[PDB]
Design a binder for these strands. Structure first.
Ligand code: CL
Ligand code: MG
Ligand code: MG
Ligand code: NA
Ligand code: NA
Ligand code: SR
Ligand code: SR
Ligand code: SR
Ligand code: SR
Ligand code: SR
Ligand code: SR
Ligand code: SR
Ligand code: SR
Lengths: 156, 186, 154, 95, 140
RNA sequence: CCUGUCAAACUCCAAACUUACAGACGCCGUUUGACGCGGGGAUUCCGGUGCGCGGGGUAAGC
RNA sequence: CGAAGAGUGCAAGAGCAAAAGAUAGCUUGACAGUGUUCUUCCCAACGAGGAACGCUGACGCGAAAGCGUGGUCUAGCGAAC
RNA sequence: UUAGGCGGCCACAGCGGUGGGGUUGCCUCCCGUACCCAUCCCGAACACGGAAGAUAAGCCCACCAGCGUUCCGGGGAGUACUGGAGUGCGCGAGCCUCUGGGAAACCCGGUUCGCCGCCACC
């Protein structure tokens, strides 16, 4: 199904699992990447900031995450970097798949609501920003236009 | 208090001094209360009323001021209790108080009890109080006969020093008599 | 004391807003009213804010408008210094104008129609789709600004 | 509403704030009001009896005599005037 | 200072938790006064398909009845330490529980103006061993 | 301990706002009688649109 | 240690701790007559049904105030002939 | 209030902690079961009778702000949200300006270790 069907916050928050059942698992493999054994004690901290409020399905969350991290293997399988996708897909989404009769939909997926300006991804690295390219690929697979933002780096 | 939601009991509940459930059923009457309280050495009777900022004691008597009328005996017994009830009752009468309802607080409604004697006293003072003669002591005990006959099983004087030797409930008869007519602070 | 002038019609105007204008004695576009500054009145005029032009006028402007537009509570009589003198607690239009501004009286209290029925603004106003700060004619004005308006509607 | 009983949609208004939980003080369950006195109507979550229909919470009526211990309070529901039987526990003097 | 601080024995509860008895007969002989039965809350597979029913009995001894018992009961026991409650209590064994506490205890057992005993007036494991040991026998 | 997130059927908080009653000012009523009461006569119980807030639906001139 | 997460017949939300819960004992108010008010039906007319609150009668328990017009509250209901 | 009784508001009063106080008005702990009354077993409690002892409990007085709570100043924030208006912007979900209101979390510093009523009483 197209992102067109769910990218907008056009429905009330539907996340209570005590009342919703049969929610598909998440396609997002991990939320912590890189040397997650270590702390965010790095020199440079870049982040991908979404420019529009939107709902991002776990479908796109996993494609963007892979697209970025997989590429961040320009540093090495066990390289010296950190990477965190900080949002979780809490919104349960449905699809009415009798025409418009009794059309409440059936759970078909989950998405993460992200407001304009929130950062969806954050990386921590040493002056080794192959990450800015990692996000160019990441922002390439999520609905909104985004802006890559270096948070702590005067090391031009 | 563990946090924001923690519920702290009302103060007088915290202090275990006021049974608010009984207090309510008590106030329903609309009548004043004959608050009967007691201690190890003394007894106290107060006629209390409801007030915008707290209760109002319109009259009252304490076993301590029982002496002022000729009491030379201990102050934590039945005769003392009855008398105090009568003293407070009489004072209540003067103050314009006509009727009341017994408030024994956290005490137990034990037959023959002093709280009940405090009550018989107030009723004899002329105060109209809902009661039950079947739960009141048998008069002779009120006079303190139970204490005299106990001294009969002497071997050693009951009261260390004090007055008498064999005790006198008759002393009680004298005080009840002294109280039922005239005298100051009444 | 503020001068209140309805510049936007009644159609599609919320009813409690139009009801307020009527309580301030204005029932037509271009009619004006002198409302004293009280918490009570302030709430009223704030409610009407988007359909009116208001502000404190100068003694001179208020005098011009009274001379040119004020009317008797009943009748087509001319309100001039002679009229004001022989009918009001005042001696001339100025005295009146001064009392109104100092809020010691009202047009009705002196036997005048509460409203001052103005003429359309000569050379037109700044527009009824934007407030003063945005270049429109709606809302609160400078004493200089409110004067420009009233003079044009003289 | 999905149902139409006396307590439909009363989740919020008939619930005590955690600290107001537990038996309420008897002082106000015994308060005396005079005919003509303006009184605010609000059910006390902790008090079971003497309640009025929840729909009337918020009303400020005029006491007009009593029935037994409960009070008879006049109010105007919309444009219709009704009389409400209500015990002190659920009332507070105005001002 | 002391005296109103020195340990006391407030109750010795001897009980047998069978799960069925006439055991009351012996518990009454070894103690001196009449025993009382104990019901069992909650039902269990071990054939306790009855909630309110006799499972055991007990006896609470206070004052002399308690001492006259401990004088012939303590010799029967052995252990000490790592067998004492935080409240300066200790139980051994038919079970035998000894409840120790300081003079101003009634303040937390009466009806009027109750109050929970301050941790400073609360007896201690050590203070307990002492008192007992300091009375016809040895510790650990 | 630290670290990353949420709620139509969660709430330690908490608006704008809506609402009861009263007072004040305004407006209005006492020859245009208001507010209220009684009686006669209806028509009406396919509505629609914009705006705000919506719930359903990928959406719709749904 | 522990304001309440237990329990209170059953949905859900709400109420309850010297109790509205537990245990024990006693008891039959799950009583008769007749109303007020609200609800049903917001506003605003409409029956059966319901509830809160009175007056009268007769009672139970309690020292007594008092509590009991069924089960803590909101479902468990039916016209004329 | 050199220690009491009944309360109102019901944590600004809770939790925890330090220090002080009793020939006596007192409150207690305390001592004791002939009686009234009591233990489904215990004068533990309840109840009754009483003062040899004590200020260690409680209690009353003075105090500490680590936790919880009430309120206030500063920052967050006139931010978030929002009643009214707009031929203002945006492909659009949506945003903005003007006008009238206006949080919450959190940080920092103060406050708070109850206040008040009636009766009694060296
Ligand atoms: Cl007492
Ligand atoms: Mg004219
Ligand atoms: Mg000390
Ligand atoms: Na309450
Ligand atoms: Na002390
Ligand atoms: Sr929608
Ligand atoms: Sr078809
Ligand atoms: Sr994109
Ligand atoms: Sr509304
Ligand atoms: Sr009931
Ligand atoms: Sr004893
Ligand atoms: Sr498009
Ligand atoms: Sr402001």
């Amino acid at each position: 199904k197209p992102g067109a069907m769910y990218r907008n916050s056009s429905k009330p928050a539907y996340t209570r699992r005590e009342y919703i059942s049969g929610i598909p698992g998440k396609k997002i493999a991990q939320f912590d990447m890189g040397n997650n054994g270590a702390g965010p004690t790095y020199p440079a901290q870049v982040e991908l900031v979404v420019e529009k409020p939107v709902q991002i399905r776990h479908n796109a969350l996993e494609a963007a995450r892979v697209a970025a991290n997989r590429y961040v293997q320009n540093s090495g399988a066990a390289a010296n970097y950190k990477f965190r996708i900080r949002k979780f897909p809490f919104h349960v989404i449905r699809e009415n798949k009798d025409g418009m009769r009794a059309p409440f939909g059936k759970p078909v997926g989950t998405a993460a609501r992200v407001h304009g300006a929130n950062h969806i991804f954050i990386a921590w690295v040493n002056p080794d920003p192959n990450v800015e390219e990692a996000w160019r690929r990441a922002k390439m697979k999520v609905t909104p236009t985004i802006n890559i933002d270096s948070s702590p780096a005067g090391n031009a | 208090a563990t946090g924001p939601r923690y519920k702290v009991p009302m103060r007088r509940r915290r202090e275990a001094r006021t049974d608010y459930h009984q207090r309510l059923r008590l106030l329903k009457s609309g009548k004043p209360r004959l608050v009967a309280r007691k201690s190890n050495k003394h007894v106290r009777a107060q006629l209390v009323t409801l007030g915008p900022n707290g209760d109002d004691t319109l009259a009252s008597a304490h076993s301590s001021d029982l002496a002022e009328y000729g009491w030379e005996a201990p102050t934590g017994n039945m005769p003392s209790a009855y008398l105090t009830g009568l003293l407070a009752g009489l004072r209540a009468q003067e103050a314009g108080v006509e009727e009341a309802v017994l408030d024994i607080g956290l005490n137990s409604p034990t037959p023959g009890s002093k709280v009940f004697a405090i009550q018989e006293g107030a009723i004899d003072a002329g105060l109209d109080i809902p009661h039950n003669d079947d739960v009141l002591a048998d008069w002779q005990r009120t006079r303190g006969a139970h204490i005299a006959e106990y001294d009969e099983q002497l071997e050693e004087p009951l009261y260390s020093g004090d007055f008498d030797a064999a005790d006198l409930p008759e002393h009680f008869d004298e005080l009840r008599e002294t109280l039922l007519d005239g005298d100051i602070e009444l | 004391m503020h001068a209140l002038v309805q510049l936007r019609g009644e159609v599609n105007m919320h009813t409690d807003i139009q009801d307020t204008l009527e309580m301030l004695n204005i029932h037509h576009v271009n009619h004006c009213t002198l409302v004293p500054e009280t918490d009570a009145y302030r709430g009223m005029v704030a409610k009407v804010n988007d359909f009116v032009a208001f502000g404190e006028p100068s003694q001179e402007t208020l005098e011009t408008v009274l001379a040119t537009r004020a009317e008797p509570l009943e009748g087509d009589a001319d309100v001039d210094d002679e009229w004001v003198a022989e009918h009001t607690d005042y001696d001339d239009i100025s005295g009146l104008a001064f009392a109104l501004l100092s809020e010691e009286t009202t047009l009705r209290e002196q036997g005048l129609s509460p409203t001052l029925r103005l003429h359309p603004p000569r050379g037109g106003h700044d527009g009824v789709k934007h407030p003063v700060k945005e270049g429109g004619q709606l809302g609160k004005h400078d004493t200089e600004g409110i004067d420009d308006l009233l003079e044009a509607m003289r | 509403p999905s149902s139409n009983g006396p307590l439909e949609g009363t989740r919020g208004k008939l619930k005590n704030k955690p600290r107001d939980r537990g038996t309420s003080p008897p002082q106000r369950a015994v308060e005396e009001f005079d005919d003509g006195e303006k009184v605010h109507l609000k059910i006390d979550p902790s008090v079971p009896n003497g309640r009025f229909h929840p729909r009337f919470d918020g009303q400020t009526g005029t006491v007009e005599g009593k029935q037994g211990d409960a009070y008879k309070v006049d109010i105007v529901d919309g444009g219709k005037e009704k009389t409400i039987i209500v015990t002190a526990a659920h009332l507070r003097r105005q001002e | 200072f002391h005296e109103m601080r020195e340990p006391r024995i407030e109750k010795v509860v001897v009980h047998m938790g069978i799960g069925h008895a006439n055991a009351e007969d012996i518990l009454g002989e070894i103690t001196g006064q009449m025993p009382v039965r104990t019901k069992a809350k909650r039902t269990v597979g071990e054939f306790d398909i009855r909630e309110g029913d006799p499972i055991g009995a007990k006896v609470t001894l206070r004052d002399e009845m308690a001492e006259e018992f401990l004088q012939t009961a303590l010799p029967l026991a052995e252990l000490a330490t790592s067998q004492f409650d935080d409240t300066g209590n200790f139980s051994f064994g038919l079970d035998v529980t000894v409840n120790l506490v300081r003079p101003g205890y009634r303040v937390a057992k009466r009806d009027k103006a109750s109050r929970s005993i301050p941790t400073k007036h609360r007896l201690n494991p050590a203070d307990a061993v002492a008192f007992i040991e300091s009375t016809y026998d040895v510790e650990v």
